[PDB]
Structures are given as structure tokens and as C-alpha cells.
């Protein structure tokens, strides 16, 4: 059902949608849409469970 209500279909649209959800303003690109998602749960300088 979750997939049934999912607009995105690949990785680009996913990262872009997340980018527009987090930072609603500037047009989502490639580097920004990726680096933003990486600096959320996949970077020591931006995420740490200690």
C-alpha cells in the first residue's frame, strides 16, 4: 500500500522529493539533491548516534 501511494519511481525523483521536502525553495539539482540526503544519515559531520 505504501508503494501504491508513492509518487516517486526511482532514485533521482526520490532524492529530489526529499530535497523539496527538506529545503522547499531553490530548484533541486543533482549534487544538492544527493549531498543533502547523504548529509542526513550518512555523514559523521551531520549525523552521529555517538
Amino acid at each position: 500500500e505504501t508503494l501504491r501511494v508513492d509518487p516517486t519511481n526511482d532514485r533521482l525523483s526520490a532524492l529530489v522529493e526529499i530535497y523539496r521536502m527538506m529545503r522547499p525553495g531553490e530548484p533541486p539539482t543533482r549534487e544538492a539533491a544527493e549531498s543533502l540526503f547523504e548529509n542526513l544519515f550518512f555523514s559523521e559531520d551531520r549525523y552521529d548516534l555517538s
Binding site: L3, V5, E17, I18, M21, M22
Partner: protein
Amino acid sequence: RRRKLPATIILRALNYTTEQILDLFFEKVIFEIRDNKLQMELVPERLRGE
């Protein structure tokens, strides 16, 4: 803590195709079409409460 999104969008954001996503939560059921009919990989334990 922002607006809600389908929890499969992060999976796609982790480079997961829809087929791969389906093969990560659910158990698959294979059907065969042989001798002009429909067969099924029956699992007795799965028939509980049906």
C-alpha cells in the same frame, strides 16, 4: 519531524528498485503455467486462518 512521505521513498533514495523493495519485506509466491493450467508452490503453514 516534518511532513509525511511514503516510507518507500527513502528506500528508493538508497538505490532500491521497486522489485528489490518487494523482495525485502514480503515472502514471494511462485506460480507455474504448465500443461495449460495454473499451479502453486503450496506452503501448509501459510494456510493458517484462511
